[PDB]
Scaffold this active site. Structure first.
Site, PDB file in Angstrom:
ATOM      1  N   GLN A   9       6.724   7.795 -10.902  1.00 41.57           N
ATOM      2  CA  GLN A   9       6.219   8.902  -9.153  1.00 41.57           C
ATOM      3  C   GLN A   9       7.256   9.196  -8.528  1.00 41.57           C
ATOM      4  O   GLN A   9       6.379  10.557  -7.748  1.00 41.57           O
ATOM      5  CB  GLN A   9       4.773   8.263  -9.258  1.00 41.57           C
ATOM      6  CG  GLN A   9       3.229   8.441 -10.410  1.00 41.57           C
ATOM      7  CD  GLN A   9       2.368   7.981  -9.314  1.00 41.57           C
ATOM      8  OE1 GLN A   9       2.223   6.948  -9.089  1.00 41.57           O
ATOM      9  NE2 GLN A   9       1.315   8.861  -9.789  1.00 41.57           N
ATOM     10  N   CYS A  29      -2.782   0.411 -13.728  1.00 38.97           N
ATOM     11  CA  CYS A  29      -2.684   0.284 -12.121  1.00 38.97           C
ATOM     12  C   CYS A  29      -3.154   1.773 -11.892  1.00 38.97           C
ATOM     13  O   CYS A  29      -4.579   1.512 -12.599  1.00 38.97           O
ATOM     14  CB  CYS A  29      -0.684   1.028 -11.759  1.00 38.97           C
ATOM     15  SG  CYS A  29      -0.386   2.772 -12.210  1.00 38.97           S
ATOM     16  N   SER A  30      -3.007   2.460 -10.648  1.00 39.93           N
ATOM     17  CA  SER A  30      -4.129   3.279 -11.098  1.00 39.93           C
ATOM     18  C   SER A  30      -4.509   4.448 -11.876  1.00 39.93           C
ATOM     19  O   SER A  30      -5.415   4.724 -12.148  1.00 39.93           O
ATOM     20  CB  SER A  30      -4.698   3.836  -9.120  1.00 39.93           C
ATOM     21  OG  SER A  30      -5.890   4.545  -9.207  1.00 39.93           O
ATOM     22  N   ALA A  31      -3.373   5.278 -11.950  1.00 41.49           N
ATOM     23  CA  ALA A  31      -3.024   6.612 -12.577  1.00 41.49           C
ATOM     24  C   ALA A  31      -2.122   5.855 -14.321  1.00 41.49           C
ATOM     25  O   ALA A  31      -1.983   7.264 -14.817  1.00 41.49           O
ATOM     26  CB  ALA A  31      -2.587   7.180 -12.499  1.00 41.49           C
ATOM     27  N   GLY A  32      -1.501   4.605 -13.804  1.00 46.52           N
ATOM     28  CA  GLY A  32      -1.186   4.469 -14.863  1.00 46.52           C
ATOM     29  C   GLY A  32       0.454   5.076 -15.471  1.00 46.52           C
ATOM     30  O   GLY A  32       0.621   5.161 -16.560  1.00 46.52           O
ATOM     31  N   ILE A  33       1.258   5.837 -15.043  1.00 50.05           N
ATOM     32  CA  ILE A  33       1.809   6.074 -15.015  1.00 50.05           C
ATOM     33  C   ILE A  33       3.626   5.280 -14.074  1.00 50.05           C
ATOM     34  O   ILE A  33       4.364   5.412 -13.855  1.00 50.05           O
ATOM     35  CB  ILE A  33       2.189   7.672 -14.829  1.00 50.05           C
ATOM     36  CG1 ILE A  33       1.635   8.093 -13.280  1.00 50.05           C
ATOM     37  CG2 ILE A  33       1.027   7.832 -15.713  1.00 50.05           C
ATOM     38  CD1 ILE A  33       1.331   9.992 -12.463  1.00 50.05           C
ATOM     39  N   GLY A  34       3.041   5.080 -12.571  1.00 51.02           N
ATOM     40  CA  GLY A  34       4.477   5.034 -11.321  1.00 51.02           C
ATOM     41  C   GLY A  34       4.104   3.355 -11.098  1.00 51.02           C
ATOM     42  O   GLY A  34       5.727   2.991 -12.343  1.00 51.02           O
ATOM     43  N   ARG A  35       3.698   2.820 -10.928  1.00 50.19           N
ATOM     44  CA  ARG A  35       4.049   1.140 -11.214  1.00 50.19           C
ATOM     45  C   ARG A  35       4.096   0.436 -12.772  1.00 50.19           C
ATOM     46  O   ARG A  35       4.718  -0.213 -13.084  1.00 50.19           O
ATOM     47  CB  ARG A  35       2.860   0.218 -10.273  1.00 50.19           C
ATOM     48  CG  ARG A  35       2.687   0.070  -8.352  1.00 50.19           C
ATOM     49  CD  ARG A  35       1.727  -0.309  -7.822  1.00 50.19           C
ATOM     50  NE  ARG A  35       1.626   0.384  -6.945  1.00 50.19           N
ATOM     51  CZ  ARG A  35       0.603  -0.166  -5.977  1.00 50.19           C
ATOM     52  NH1 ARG A  35      -0.584  -1.234  -5.953  1.00 50.19           N
ATOM     53  NH2 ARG A  35       0.237   0.565  -5.045  1.00 50.19           N
ATOM     54  N   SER A  36       3.232   0.981 -13.387  1.00 52.96           N
ATOM     55  CA  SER A  36       2.640   0.750 -14.844  1.00 52.96           C
ATOM     56  C   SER A  36       4.734   1.050 -15.874  1.00 52.96           C
ATOM     57  O   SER A  36       4.568   0.901 -16.248  1.00 52.96           O
ATOM     58  CB  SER A  36       2.184   1.572 -15.087  1.00 52.96           C
ATOM     59  OG  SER A  36       0.156   1.160 -15.648  1.00 52.96           O
ATOM     60  N   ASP A  92       1.023  -1.052   0.188  1.00 55.67           N
ATOM     61  CA  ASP A  92       0.254   0.835  -0.398  1.00 55.67           C
ATOM     62  C   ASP A  92       0.858   1.557   0.063  1.00 55.67           C
ATOM     63  O   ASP A  92       1.015   2.368  -0.282  1.00 55.67           O
ATOM     64  CB  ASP A  92      -0.905   0.356   1.326  1.00 55.67           C
ATOM     65  CG  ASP A  92      -2.372  -0.387   0.676  1.00 55.67           C
ATOM     66  OD1 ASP A  92      -2.595  -1.549  -0.032  1.00 55.67           O
ATOM     67  OD2 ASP A  92      -3.392  -0.598   1.732  1.00 55.67           O
TER      68      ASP A  92
END
EC number: 3.1.3.48
Length: 284
Positions: free
Chosen positions: A262, A215-222, A181
């Site tokens: 991010q 992911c949620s925003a599609g920039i960090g983990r993605s 998390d």
């Protein structure tokens, strides 16, 4: 400069925040006018994360062709990816329309539906074989065929049917379920194992359309997923693997979607993953 020495240098000097801010300063800025039109407000999860006009995925419909999704086309590595936000209640039909129209074989999901007590994306696939989903706005049917739950990820076989033509296709859903998390994983071993399972399936390969990753925003983990994959492939292809420059690859990727990676902790984790993964690519 061998990235492994670059890594120890930054770590000992504790300058990750400085390195990361340099990337933010040098990153491309291109227009995103379509994302900001009033008619698209309920198609965006976050006001500050938008696809550039020049690289956005267009839906094949005359009404409104907009989805928050970008094509990342890596020319030397010969890999392409679609990066998108976690689908919203009003965009789950658009999401599967894009998977169909772009001829994708795999969907890669790097978040849980609920994290930190809040919803991070819609429940956009069926959880039971006998309870299929119908998306009436885009005329698609989606059925759960099988599910394999492992300690760090789940793989699902799904059937997508275009109700207009009755064609069917098999889609593979690769769900990484253990990103914490807060922060990043302590070891990249399970994330790398997951990446290799996606590769082994054919979902990243040129005989199919681009993989869809979110992911949620599609920039960090993605962004971590596609950056690690492309760097490892370049180390395979080149005469001198130590010539691969992860900061330069990230800036190339940011020509196609804003904000990839991010935090400074996500940047450090990406380095760690490529360094440890290279101890398979190079033959160990």
């Amino acid at each position: 400069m061998e990235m492994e020495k670059e890594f120890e240098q930054i770590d000992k000097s504790g300058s990750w925040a400085a390195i990361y801010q340099d990337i933010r300063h040098e990153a491309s800025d291109f227009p995103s006018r379509v994302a900001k039109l009033p008619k698209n407000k309920n198609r965006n999860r976050y006001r500050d994360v938008s696809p550039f006009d020049h690289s956005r995925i267009k839906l094949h419909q005359e009404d409104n062709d907009y989805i928050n999704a970008s094509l990342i086309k890596m020319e030397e590595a010969q890999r392409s990816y679609i990066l998108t936000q976690g689908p919203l209640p009003n965009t789950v039909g658009h999401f599967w329309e894009m998977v169909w129209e772009q001829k994708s074989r795999g969907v890669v999901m790097l978040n849980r539906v609920m994290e930190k007590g809040s919803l991070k994306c819609a429940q956009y696939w069926p959880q039971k074989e006998e309870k299929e989903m119908i998306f009436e706005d885009t005329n698609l049917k989606l059925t759960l065929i099988s599910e394999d739950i492992k300690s760090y990820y789940t793989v699902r076989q799904l059937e997508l049917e275009n109700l207009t033509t009755q064609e069917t296709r098999e889609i593979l859903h690769f769900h990484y379920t253990t990103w914490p998390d807060f922060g990043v994983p302590e070891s990249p071993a399970s994330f790398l194992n997951f990446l290799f399972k996606v590769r082994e399936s054919g979902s990243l390969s040129p005989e199919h359309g681009p993989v869809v990753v979110h992911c949620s925003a599609g920039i960090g983990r993605s962004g971590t997923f596609c950056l690690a994959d492309t760097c490892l492939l370049l180390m395979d292809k080149r005469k001198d693997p130590s010539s691969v420059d992860i900061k330069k690859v990230l800036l190339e990727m940011r020509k196609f979607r804003m904000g990839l990676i991010q935090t400074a902790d996500q940047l450090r984790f990406s380095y760690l993953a490529v360094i440890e993964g290279a101890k398979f690519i190079m033959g160990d």
